[PDB]
Design a protein around this ligand. Structure first.
Ligand SMILES: N#Cc1cc(Cl)cc(Oc2c(Br)ccc(CNC(=O)c3[nH]c(N)nc3Cl)c2F)c1
Ligand SMILES: [Mg+2]
Ligand SMILES: [Mg+2]
Ligand SMILES: [Mg+2]
Lengths: 560, 411
């Protein structure tokens, strides 16, 4: 059959302390035995395996499978046990190429290596552990034993050893042809140049011949594929790329399976179709039914799905990357925790798009979310292009300035400019720095019984007011927030509030505009309606006036 | 040049730490550096049978424009601790921090002349990544003692002692301490004389083929005898509101977990009843005396708090605004061993400056780096810290969001 590379082998060890596998071969049908003898005879002739004796004590099971409407037998070796005992290797790829990171080339050629693993030699000292046995009919006599001379299919080390072998083989070609781009991916090479088509086809032949001198076969001009290249769910054309066609089914009844598959396709689409949303569709999956159970689409899910169909009705393509120009990233708020972005070099020819949703923490605001989105895009850009984009953001410089200089966390958005693309990011209230003269002072508190889960929230005020509300199935945290909420409800447009809850204070000081807690959402609604709010903290149980009296009020019947 | 054998902490395997994404500029710098190192024999390409990895970065030397390779050996350092701490521990002199001036000299170049034990080399694997996963990363391991591994000075110790012997003998009151890739040289000399001695030391080092304002976070020299308490300070007013007293009581309450003696009984008596926050409360003579006693307490050190060498150091940092940051180092919480302030860009730059300053102080004081609790999003730090980092070491860190009033209480 085919060449085996004369490349040096990689030395391979078993994990420390462990010996090779010794897994018994089960008896096989005569049919399967005959198939395996034919297969192994031919593999031995082609140099892929060699006969060994009973001297080698190792064994991995072998099997033969022929599909029902088919005449071709295949050998299957079950390397599970050898794999468990083989050393760890360096991981094969830290990530996969994004098409938006590719630089446009005049000519591109794909070369897939034929029978890749079987063209690389296996370390001589390791071959013994790959032993297997074709059993005799009704296991009466000794079987015929073989070991591998090349990288086996399904063995733990094959992918990494193949990759490093290809890397070594390419090194002198690269060194001599620095202009030629060669991506390595699994058994493939993707080879781009800006040479004229004649000289490109010549260099491809030189590469093929170089690879052949090292025992690696590749398709000739005739068999080589032509664009667009269908690759890992993408279409790569000469001056554009996109995702392969997305089929969004029409269905009377959506199964969880159907919905999971839809959201996956929509997520895949979002890297070039701007403004794809999946929030309402994802909400439907937050249950605990699974597989073939039918989830009725909510109206918000129907609206979301309808909007996505409109986005997808006509093809959209991305452009490739030009390294001599800056990257520009624009972000918009789409509402309810959803953000969308586009990255281009010339307005408005997107290299790619994306979305950000992530709720970080229990309570947040749009300035924090925007910063998080910017951080995500910044990392993605370093990965794809090796540099950071300049940003265009829907937040005024003054808003950003006020926030970061006052906030207790270090923040740093790199180079950015305000773009007036509503809705603009702002903060919806602010707390006073000083107590308010002429405003009523409320001393608030809450208490909860750990055993009964009953509680009270309440206030006293310097103008002599008091109030206590009773709560059930609550917690100390919730009662402390309930109390602040009471004070906000019962106060005028200006109010001073004194809490002993560091928890509540921390939440409110960060100017949340959105929360997973309905109670916190009620407090935010009140805070926005006020003209002035001063919130202050005092330590509990220090006999501090005002706090002492509300403490007694809410503890009654709850805690001693 | 027989190598020194190195065992891992029994049961521990080598580091398998993900390489963080690098900008093109830094990848290109690293490729150039590593190509030269490979030529000189310091490192060698490795194959996929090496499963280990340690992250690498590129930073700027001094206030210089040359790229330097920084290897983040924090994991390998943790996994080799019995080696560099128990077996070949460099003792830390308590007199260093008492010197008038301490100069820090980079001696990392000394290590590359000492072969690394052949059985250990595999654990020093690192990767130069490519952009967009175009090509597999370039993989190398070390053949020589690597910069940033705490094993290297541990091994080089007896050589450094021979190098420094004449100088130490001729200058018995100068204290020289090695920590990782640096020497810390302290004297009580006048600064001219101190710097003359440093230049002498440089000449000694030069004779062993070691050819060694730069930073904004420290000057030419350190002046550790200058470092003194950052007192929790209480305000002084001619008029006190209910709100002001409440603030004060909260500050004192938390101060009392650190300092014994702190009393608030009298101050709380003034807040009896349900008062308007803006009501002015004249301090009675009793409250005034309590306040005065509290001030005296806060000016003096904390009785009963001592460094324990068996325990890790922790550093917490607070952003105070207007370019100011406060910090505390402890081992048990509220048992502050040292507090301070770093002052005077962007937030991430300033924070990296504070971290480097605090770590340096900590090396000088205890010969150990603290684990930092950093007030910043993890990803933001990871993206940006190398843009401003200039030290050849990297402390441990984790990320917190610890508001609110802990900040108020330190300024
Ligand atoms: N299959 C496949 C595949 C996958 C990847 Cl990640 C890259 C690839 O080849 C390319 C290389 Br090498 C470099 C650039 C691009 C982008 N496409 C082009 O430049 C291009 N040019 C021409 N004439 N056809 C194509 Cl397609 C490339 F497409 C081909
Ligand atoms: Mg309370
Ligand atoms: Mg409570
Ligand atoms: Mg209370």
């Amino acid at each position: 059959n085919s060449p085996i590379s004369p490349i040096e082998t990689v030395p391979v060890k078993l994990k420390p302390g462990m010996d090779g596998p010794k897994v018994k071969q089960w008896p096989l049908t005569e049919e399967k035995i005959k198939a395996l003898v034919e297969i192994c005879t031919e593999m031995e002739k082609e140099g892929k395996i060699s006969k060994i004796g009973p001297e080698n004590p190792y064994n991995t099971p072998v099997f033969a499978i022929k599909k029902k409407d088919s005449t071709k037998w295949r050998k299957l070796v079950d390397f599970r046990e050898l794999n468990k005992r083989t050393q760890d290797f360096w991981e094969v790829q830290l990530g996969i190429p994004h098409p938006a990171g590719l630089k446009k080339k005049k000519s591109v050629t794909v070369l897939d290596v034929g029978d890749a693993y079987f063209s690389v030699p296996l370390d001589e000292d390791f071959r013994k552990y790959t032993a297997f046995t074709i059993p005799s009919i009704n296991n009466e006599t000794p079987g015929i034993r073989y070991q591998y001379n090349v990288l086996p299919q399904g063995w733990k080390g094959s992918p990494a050893i193949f990759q490093s072998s290809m890397t070594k083989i390419l090194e002198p070609f690269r060194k001599q042809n620095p202009d030629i781009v060669i991506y390595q991916y699994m058994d493939d090479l993707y080879v781009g140049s800006d040479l004229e088509i004649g000289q490109h086809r010549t260099k491809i032949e030189e590469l093929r011949q170089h690879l052949l001198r090292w025992g690696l076969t590749t398709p000739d001009k005739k068999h080589q594929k032509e664009p667009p290249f269908l690759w890992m769910g993408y279409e790569l054309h000469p001056d554009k790329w996109t995702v392969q066609p997305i089929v969004l089914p029409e269905k009377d009844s959506w199964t969880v399976n159907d919905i999971q598959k839809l959201v996956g396709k929509l997520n895949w689409a979002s890297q070039i179709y701007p403004g794809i949303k999946v929030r309402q569709l994802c909400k439907l999956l937050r249950g605990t039914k699974a597989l073939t159970e039918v989830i009725p689409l909510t109206e918000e899910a129907e609206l979301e799905l309808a909007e996505n169909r409109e986005i997808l009705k006509e093809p959209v393509h991305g452009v490739y990357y030009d390294p001599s120009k800056d990257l520009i990233a624009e972000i918009q708020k789409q509402g309810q925790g959803q953000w969308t972005y586009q990255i281009y070099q010339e307005p408005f020819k997107n290299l790619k798009t994306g979305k950000y949703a992530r709720m970080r923490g229990a309570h947040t605001n749009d300035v924090k979310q925007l910063t998080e989105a910017v951080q995500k895009i910044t990392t993605e850009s370093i990965v794809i292009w090796g540099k950071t984009p300049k940003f265009k953001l829907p937040i005024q410089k003054e808003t950003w300035e006020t926030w970061w200089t006052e906030y207790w966390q270090a923040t740093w958005i790199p180079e950015w400019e305000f773009v007036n693309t509503p809705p603009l990011v702002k903060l919806w209230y602010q707390l006073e720095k000083e107590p308010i003269v002429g405003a009523e002072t409320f001393y608030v508190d809450g208490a909860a019984n750990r055993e009964t889960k009953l509680g009270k929230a309440g206030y006293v005020t310097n103008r002599g007011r008091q109030k206590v509300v009773t709560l059930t199935d609550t917690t100390n945290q919730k009662t402390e927030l309930q109390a602040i909420y009471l004070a906000l409800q019962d106060s005028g447009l200006e109010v001073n509030i004194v809490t002993d809850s560091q928890y509540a204070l921390g939440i409110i000081q960060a100017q949340p505009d959105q929360s997973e807690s309905e109670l916190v959402n009620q407090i935010i609604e009140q805070l926005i309606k006020k003209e002035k709010v001063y919130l202050a903290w005092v330590p509990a149980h220090k006999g501090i006036g005002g706090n002492e009296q509300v403490d007694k009020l809410v503890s009654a019947g709850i805690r001693k | 040049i027989e190598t020194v054998p190195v065992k891992l902490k029994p049961g521990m395997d080598g580091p398998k730490v993900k390489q963080w994404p690098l900008t093109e500029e830094k990848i290109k710098a690293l490729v150039e550096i590593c190509t030269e190192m490979e030529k000189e024999g310091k490192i060698s390409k490795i194959g996929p049978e090496n499963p280990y990895n340690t992250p690498v970065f590129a930073i700027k030397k001094k206030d210089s424009t040359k790229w330097r390779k920084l290897v983040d050996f924090r994991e390998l350092n943790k996994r080799t601790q019995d080696f560099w701490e128990v077996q070949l521990g460099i003792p830390h002199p308590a007199g260093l921090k008492k010197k008038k001036s301490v100069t820090v000299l980079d001696v990392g170049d000394a290590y590359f002349s000492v072969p690394l034990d052949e059985d250990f080399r595999k654990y020093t694997a690192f990767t130069i990544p490519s952009i967009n996963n175009e090509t597999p990363g370039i993989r190398y391991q070390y053949n020589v003692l690597p910069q940033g591994w705490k094993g290297s000075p541990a091994i080089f110790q007896s050589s450094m002692t021979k190098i420094l012997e004449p100088f130490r003998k001729q200058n018995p009151d100068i204290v020289i301490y090695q920590y990782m890739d640096d020497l810390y040289v302290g004297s009580d000399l006048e600064i001219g004389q101190h710097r003359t001695k440093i230049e002498e030391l440089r000449q000694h080092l030069l004779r062993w083929g070691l050819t060694t304002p730069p930073f904004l976070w420290m000057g030419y020299e350190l002046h550790p005898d200058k470092w003194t308490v950052q007192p929790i300070v209480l305000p002084e007013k001619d008029s006190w509101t209910v709100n002001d007293i409440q603030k004060l009581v909260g500050k004192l309450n938390w101060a009392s977990q650190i300092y014994p003696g702190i009393k608030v009984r009298q101050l709380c008596k003034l807040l009896r009843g349900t008062k308007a926050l803006t009501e002015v409360i004249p301090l009675t003579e009793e409250a005034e005396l309590e306040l005065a006693e509290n001030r005296e307490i806060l000016k003096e050190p904390v009785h009963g708090v001592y460094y324990d060498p068996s325990k890790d150091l922790i550093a917490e940092i607070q952003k105070q605004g207007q370019g100011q940051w406060t910090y505390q180092i402890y081992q048990e919480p509220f048992k502050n061993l040292k507090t301070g302030k770093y002052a005077r860009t962007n937030d991430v730059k300033q924070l990296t400056e504070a971290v480097q300053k605090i770590t340096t102080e900590s090396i000088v004081i205890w010969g150990k780096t603290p684990k930092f609790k950093l007030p910043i999003q993890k990803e933001t730090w990871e993206t940006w810290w190398t843009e401003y980092w200039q030290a050849t070491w990297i402390p441990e860190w984790e990320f917190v969001n610890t508001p609110p009033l802990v900040k108020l209480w330190y300024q």
